[PDB]
Amino acid sequence: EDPQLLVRVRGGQLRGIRLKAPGGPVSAFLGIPFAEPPVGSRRFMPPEPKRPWSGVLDATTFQNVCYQYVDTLYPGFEGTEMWNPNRELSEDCLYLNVWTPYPRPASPTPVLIWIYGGGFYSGAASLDVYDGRFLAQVEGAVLVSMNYRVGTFGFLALPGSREAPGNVGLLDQRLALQWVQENIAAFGGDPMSVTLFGESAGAASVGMHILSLPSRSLFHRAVLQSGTPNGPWATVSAGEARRRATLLARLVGCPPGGAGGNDTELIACLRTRPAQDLVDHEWHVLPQESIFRFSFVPVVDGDFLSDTPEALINTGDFQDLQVLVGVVKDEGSYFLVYGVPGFSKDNESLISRAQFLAGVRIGVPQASDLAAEAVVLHYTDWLHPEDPTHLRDAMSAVVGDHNVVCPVAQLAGRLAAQGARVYAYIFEHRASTLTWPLWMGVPHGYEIEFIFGLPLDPSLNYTTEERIFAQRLMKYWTNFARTGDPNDPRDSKSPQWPPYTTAAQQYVSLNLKPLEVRRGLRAQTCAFWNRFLPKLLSAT
Amino acid sequence: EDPQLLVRVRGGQLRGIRLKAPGGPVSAFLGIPFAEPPVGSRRFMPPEPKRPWSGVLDATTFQNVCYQYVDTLYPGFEGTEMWNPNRELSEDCLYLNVWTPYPRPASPTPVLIWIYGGGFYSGAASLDVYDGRFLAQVEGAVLVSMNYRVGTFGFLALPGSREAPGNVGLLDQRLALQWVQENIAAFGGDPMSVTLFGESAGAASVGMHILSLPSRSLFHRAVLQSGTPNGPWATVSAGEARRRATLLARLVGCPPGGAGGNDTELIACLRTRPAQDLVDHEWHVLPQESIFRFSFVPVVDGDFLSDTPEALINTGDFQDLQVLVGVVKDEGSYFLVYGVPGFSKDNESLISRAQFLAGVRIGVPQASDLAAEAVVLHYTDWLHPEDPTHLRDAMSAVVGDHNVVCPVAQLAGRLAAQGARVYAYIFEHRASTLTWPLWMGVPHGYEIEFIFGLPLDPSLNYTTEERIFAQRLMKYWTNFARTGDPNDPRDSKSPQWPPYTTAAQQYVSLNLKPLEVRRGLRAQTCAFWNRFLPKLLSAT
Numbered sequence A, B: 001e002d003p004q005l006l007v008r009v010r011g012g013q014l015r016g017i018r019l020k021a022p023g024g025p026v027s028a029f030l031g032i033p034f035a036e037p038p039v040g041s042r043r044f045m046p047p048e049p050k051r052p053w054s055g056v057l058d059a060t061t062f063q064n065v066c067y068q069y070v071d072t073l074y075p076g077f078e079g080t081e082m083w084n085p086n087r088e089l090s091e092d093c094l095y096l097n098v099w100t101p102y103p104r105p106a107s108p109t110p111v112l113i114w115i116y117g118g119g120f121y122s123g124a125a126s127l128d129v130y131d132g133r134f135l136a137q138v139e140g141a142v143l144v145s146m147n148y149r150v151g152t153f154g155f156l157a158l159p160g161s162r163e164a165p166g167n168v169g170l171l172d173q174r175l176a177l178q179w180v181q182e183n184i185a186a187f188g189g190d191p192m193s194v195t196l197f198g199e200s201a202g203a204a205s206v207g208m209h210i211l212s213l214p215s216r217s218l219f220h221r222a223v224l225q226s227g228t229p230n231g232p233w234a235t236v237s238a239g240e241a242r243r244r245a246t247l248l249a250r251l252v253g254c255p256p257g258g259a260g261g262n263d264t265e266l267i268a269c270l271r272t273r274p275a276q277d278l279v280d281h282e283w284h285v286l287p288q289e290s291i292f293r294f295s296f297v298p299v300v301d302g303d304f305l306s307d308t309p310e311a312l313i314n315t316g317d318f319q320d321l322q323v324l325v326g327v328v329k330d331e332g333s334y335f336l337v338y339g340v341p342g343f344s345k346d347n348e349s350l351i352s353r354a355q356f357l358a359g360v361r362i363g364v365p366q367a368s369d370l371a372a373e374a375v376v377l378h379y380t381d382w383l384h385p386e387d388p389t390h391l392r393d394a395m396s397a398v399v400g401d402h403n404v405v406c407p408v409a410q411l412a413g414r415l416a417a418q419g420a421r422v423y424a425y426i427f428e429h430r431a432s433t434l435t436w437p438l439w440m441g442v443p444h445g446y447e448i449e450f451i452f453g454l455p456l457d458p459s460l461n462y463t464t465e466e467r468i469f470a471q472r473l474m475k476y477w478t479n480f481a482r483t484g485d486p487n488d489p490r491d492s493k494s495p496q497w498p499p500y501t502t503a504a505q506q507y508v509s510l511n512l513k514p515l516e517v518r519r520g521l522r523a524q525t526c527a528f529w530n531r532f533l534p535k536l537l538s539a540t
């Protein structure tokens, strides 16, 4: 028995597996359970702390993926399939993962926690691109990641019921976080240096921990990659949530025979439905044809979030908060091929003007005709109104600016203005090994592999500079994790990454070239989306 | 008694005068009556053709200027004073002026008819900048210009009434146009080739002639400099004319003293008022705090204007028409000094953000709160929103774009779409002798002295390049008058001035360098004022 690979946590004993990162060893504790499995009558309920077990629990592989819809967009293609579940689907899925260096470190080392995204309807911590060997090996970090319930299981809500209260997916994350307070010391990590980081819904989730009081004392610093809690997709109102829950139920059994008294009678019936029945109907509840909108997402309940994220980033006190936030170069491109007519990976998607107008209604489902028109106005080249290249790229900026870029800038701006230290970036590097067309640029989420150090592992066939690049990234992230500043703490010329400020609006390019400072993250456009358009949507 | 200075026209005989241009003599016949004096009971009435006279009418000097408001912005300043009346004010003012080569030309010469501007409230054909002797001597042109009634005298309307039908200043112009058909042959001009040109309200009037059938038959080609019949200031509805006319009456004591009367009674009361009382009250009737809005302008009466200029341009057939239109570099600057707080000729006029926002409301008086916010959204630099140099230039562009540039762009595009040959330009040269400050650039009106060839008079102190440049401009205009193309025909390698078309949106810049071809006349911004803002303003 290897004493490194065996740890005791408050619930009992665990056995890790020794892992061979390309520059030496690491200890992995995979599949540690942090909650009672939320099944049977616990479906839709807040998670409960895992009861203590006896014996030695085998922590040597990834546990089940939380039950979820699986995209069938391009069956067979690694571009999409790299993102699909890689373990069996199960409602029994509340498990986290821990990576420490081998051997267990020196003194209390800074802790990174990953929260995966996927529109709150998909994702798994067990994915290749989220493998924490490298950050732990190469930078001596303790890297934690958890599974949390998605779709209906995590976010179906009958607001104000005891029984399907909403936001239980975030409660899952909050429980994994509490577990790190209580247990990470045992692996080397430091409970007083905890940094969150996530991408998409993962970032929106980090956002939400920033915004929810009971979460604040469980972490110190935060990274939001390509996603924010404010913005058009990451929350719904209590009333739209009830509408969606009630309609979902009605379509499966639920309650039986048009009966509408007890919300708990409604939920009891839903708990009798096979998991696949729920997933089978989850898309049917959206209110219009759209993209970048998801059926079951965090709800503004007056509870986990005491007001909307918009209201809560305006009025917050954020003195003691260091944050790092950014976007990739082409946030919008995946979304088009996913759900706007005219866009594919197989041709190169030079659309007509009609397609672009139709695309704007799909990309901006909440828009009235006048709002839709405002959007067309800003994004059209009135000199070349039908240049199919311009149209294609424009349609991509609409979706990416509306959903990601501008809410990131809004977030950066409000946090800076309310006392936070904020660093911002834009990721413009396109991987040599990417298999999506050139027209798609750097799409949503293809910075993850470089933050995670995957271009290390040389059997992946990442170029030599991609490798150096990855190491820079890993430095910035872990630097930020340690200090609240991604800059090298004594570095002779690099240069600096300055804080983002409302006054100067500085943010850095992240590519193969050295760090370049820029000013105004799509400033004119974000003024359109963040100040003007809301005024025009309401009143219209 | 030169047989060259003596002429018989339908009404009788006239004697003109031999004048020295720089390059040789010209013949001028100034002060020719083309209508019966519109005084006494003829105030506000359509003009009547001048009755035949006997003897030789002395046509050797300019006649009285139509009654009008005299501007007092900078008393004693040359820059403002070159525009003011230079003969006595009088209601007896319907006179025209002809300039031809001396001796009178041997072949029928293309005729150029100039219509001055002045916001429909000021102007005279006798200003030094409207002197036809250069075009006559250098290009062999027959140049005509008329006085037409301005302000209340020309545009006070009780629409539907007999005694004040409206548009009577347009009718003054039309009668001068008829007089040209009937009589120009006697001076050597060709009535089969008549080109109208005008600036500002002069240009708006030219466009109104294009759009009114009884005017169309009297001319062949038109030139519009910095004004258009469509747009926010050139016309008013019948309702608003009636409300302004009735208010003016009330202010000068016309019910008399009691109620609101017949139209007949109100007009007869107005006719008893001295001219200066009417001039004195004409600004009193404007509805809002504004710039670039005038009290008494052409009314949409369903007679002269059978529908709005906007409607008429969207639906006419303009196949037989050639038009040359364009703008100066800084259309709005003068208006800022006239009426927007923060702007002055005596300093650089750097303004604060609050001033820019107040300015937008003055410059776009019809705008609702949200419409004004759209303007501010468009023109703010969101990276440097308080930059005072930027704000000052923005404030100028808002006013220039809204009132002149964009309405010009709309006319050029509608006319080209409906089959007109169109040429468009931007005049970018700042007179070496200009006395307005640098920040004002090339203001409204300041291309006129170049078109009319004033730089050819070496006592005015323009540079040599200015003289070369005036020569070029005169050729373009007279080439256009002769053929409907401003290009030099027996020539090549100039460059060419291509027609403005809706696909390519080509226009040229006119300055000391050779013609540069540019594409899209403020395209992004004009799509804003011309397509989006009306929808927003009507939805709001």
Ligand SMILES: Nc1c2c(nc3cc(Cl)ccc13)C[C@H]1C=C(CCCCn3cc(CO)nn3)C[C@@H]2C1
Pocket: A079, A080, A083, A117, A118, A119, A122, A123, A199, A200, A201, A290, A291, A292, A293, A294, A334, A335, A338, A339, A436, A443, A444, A445, A446
């Ligand atoms: N599956 C992907 C993910 C990511 N990026 C991908 C990029 C490409 Cl080119 C292809 C697939 C991707 C990043 C993370 C975010 C998601 C959410 C994907 C949402 C797709 N979607 C569904 C809808 C509903 O109409 N709208 N958009 C899912 C996952 C994690």
Ligand SMILES: Nc1c2c(nc3cc(Cl)ccc13)C[C@H]1C=C(CCCCn3cc(CO)nn3)C[C@@H]2C1
Pocket: B071, B079, B080, B083, B117, B118, B119, B122, B123, B200, B201, B290, B291, B292, B293, B294, B334, B335, B338, B339, B436, B443, B444, B445, B446
């Ligand atoms: N008097 C001027 C004219 C011209 N350009 C001038 C430029 C400068 Cl910088 C100074 C005076 C100018 C060109 C022609 C047009 C006019 C109309 C002036 C309208 C001013 N105004 C008054 C109002 C009332 O709010 N709004 N704008 C008047 C006249 C002919």
Ligand SMILES: [Cl-]
Pocket: A517, A518, A519
């Ligand atoms: Cl830059």
Ligand SMILES: [Cl-]
Pocket: B019, B020
């Ligand atoms: Cl003289």
Ligand SMILES: [Cl-]
Pocket: B086
């Ligand atoms: Cl004089």
